[PDB]
Write a protein that binds this ligand. Sequence first.
Ligand SMILES: COC[C@@H](C)c1nc2cc(-c3noc(=O)[nH]3)nc(-c3cncc(Cl)c3)c2n1[C@H](C)[C@H]1CC[C@H](C)CC1
Length: 96
Amino acid sequence: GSQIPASEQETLVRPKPLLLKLLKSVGAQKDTYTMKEVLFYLGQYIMTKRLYDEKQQHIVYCSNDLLGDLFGVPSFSVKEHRKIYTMIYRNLVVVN
Ligand SMILES: COC[C@@H](C)c1nc2cc(-c3noc(=O)[nH]3)nc(-c3cncc(Cl)c3)c2n1[C@H](C)[C@H]1CC[C@H](C)CC1
């Protein structure tokens, strides 16, 4: 949560095909993204599709959704910051 450095938002990534499919439904297509962008587009995907129950323990429900196949989970909490970064990282390649 608070032990995640700000520098993490600047990491450059090439999404794997399924994460890219998902990103293409909410943002401009491109080869390389920042982590800031991947987080904003994933957030926008979830909110637009009404996958997130805010006043219900802050859980994203994704078992009826491609997001679920991407993450390998039926649901998760937006408070599980390290978990989320990990599930995202497994769906992309870091570039440098
Ligand atoms: C449903 O998402 C809507 C979006 C606007 C959002 N609402 C958050 C609430 C909290 C929060 N955290 O603690 C609390 O109590 N609420 N945190 C985040 C957060 C922000 N940056 C890094 C991470 Cl891993 C988490 C939130 N997001 C970020 C943009 C979204 C979270 C889900 C992942 C897959 C994409 C990114």
